[PDB]
Ligand binder design. Sequence first.
Ligand SMILES: N[C@H](CO)Cc1ccc(O)cc1
Length: 673
Amino acid sequence: HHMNTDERYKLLRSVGEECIQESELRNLIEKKPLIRCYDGFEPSGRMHIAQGIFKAVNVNKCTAAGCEFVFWVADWFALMNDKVGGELEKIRIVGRYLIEVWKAAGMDMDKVLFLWSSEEITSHADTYWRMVLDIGRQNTIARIKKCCTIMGKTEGTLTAAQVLYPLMQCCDIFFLKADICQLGLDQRKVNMLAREYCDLIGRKLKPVILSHHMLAGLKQGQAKMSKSDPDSAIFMEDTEEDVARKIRQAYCPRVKQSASAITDDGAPVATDDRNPVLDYFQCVVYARPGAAATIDGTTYATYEDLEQAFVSDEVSEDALKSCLIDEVNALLEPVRQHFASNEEAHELLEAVKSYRKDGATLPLAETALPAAPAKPHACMWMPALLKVPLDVAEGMIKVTKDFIAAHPEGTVTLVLPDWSAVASDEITGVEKDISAALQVNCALLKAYGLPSSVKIVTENEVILGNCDDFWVSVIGIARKNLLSHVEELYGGEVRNAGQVIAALMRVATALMLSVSHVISTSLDGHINAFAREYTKERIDCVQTLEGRIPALHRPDDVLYLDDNDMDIRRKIKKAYSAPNEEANPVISVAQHLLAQHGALSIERGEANGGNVSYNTPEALVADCGSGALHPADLKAAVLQLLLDRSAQARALLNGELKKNMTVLRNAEKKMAK
Ligand SMILES: N[C@H](CO)Cc1ccc(O)cc1
């Protein structure tokens, strides 16, 4: 029996309570031979019948229709959602068990593949993570805040930098090149975000969202199976005595079952006329191809047939219930038998058993400390700007000298955040652009005299140098701090999720370079304080010294460290400078110059003043107002000095950095739009 197009569409469509784009699903069926359905799971522990049997039933439908089914065994996602005491070591071991059961349960594995999140992410770190960051960059915190029910959590201002998990799950859909997203209706909001992110990255074809039904819980109150009630659902380990007890006492309204209005968040809701006994009949028996119930002689061909018989009292409740008990025990026995016989398999279940010992609530919840650096070491982040002010550059130069002198055999590292800044959506939000901006502005800061002892390093190098350990720590820092906390650092509001990831990345970078002190500029704001806080106030914070080189307007008129000949020339021209005045932006720049050098000298000619030198700031302010220093004589001297100092940095603009300057000024053209 080779199926025609219609027959396959009918069977594949059958798997989903909803199907985002039936039209899209039918294109795939007609066009593509090995369609990728995907699903994923946190190996949380004991396996409930929905996941054991009902999932097998649906995978088998997918594969029969001519699909390939890829399972994302999401070890880290369970870890991020605190699933098993936060002990990852052999959550693997659980995962291994879950697969062993599916085999016994009847999943046809010929076209099913299992991948392990840990293995596959680590292996393609750059590909995976860069996207995980891009999705958070192009999306509002609000939107990702809304994906909270895929993890069984509430958006309640009580989410734990666990706005990362969605970004990652969303990424998985593209990483694994999913054609169809065949996960539960819970996960709806993440899959939605993937479809949305398709319109952004341009990708023409969106993933089809074929969301499966959420099995009802066995008691009146509950819509799904919960963890704190073993009797809410049948588990694959239950003895036939267990299966009896649990279904016998199960809620069982005599009301015809009719499909529920599709909620937005996907999550189910309990009606008083929700009948789980019937829901098990529809999902675990009748959904199997050949399957049909048989009570008291008569065999009900459709589920619908059985349902009528019950509600018209042809079949008793006690009879209906007694049938499901027989019927379910039939589905489990094969699995039970297997683990009673296969020694390797029993070992694996007993292995789950030797984890069961005691439990959470809470001798559990595992995370990870750090250790203190042997000698002093400060790190500082290069402002992610297309034009960095001169005031700022000179500020971060002096902090460096000051720190070196006061910790003579310590160390100083300058970090170029070429990952974080893209996540934050700095500048144009493009990667090539931001990395060019950083590489230039750094190059000049050295030309303006950044010490050689400073170790310059890009985040790319730090991460891809030591990948796992990095992100594992990011994950770990992430778990301990609440979202609401991280948002404080940006003054209580964030522009996008990427900024929540950027703050996390810095703390992580500080820990990895084994930093003692974090150096901050005005552009850093309060972000770097996170490092100090996360280290129980161990890491000290040092603030740069700025506000010596003002804006040139009177109370782009501000000296940036990439000003060329023309720029320095004209910017001064516009600088304010009233006559007989002793307080203005040209003087503030001149006094700074005089301080740094140790004596300013205007170079006149005789009669028209004569030349003069000033080596104090009181002796200049006098001469500017009540005095014989005209705006032009001072401005002339300043401009020469500003140029003369920059000379070294400027040769780079029409030389080595010219290459990248092209790409920078092209960025500036997009921001004008
Ligand atoms: N969040 C899902 C259920 O808790 C687990 C998951 C599924 C698919 C993924 O690509 C990632 C995680």
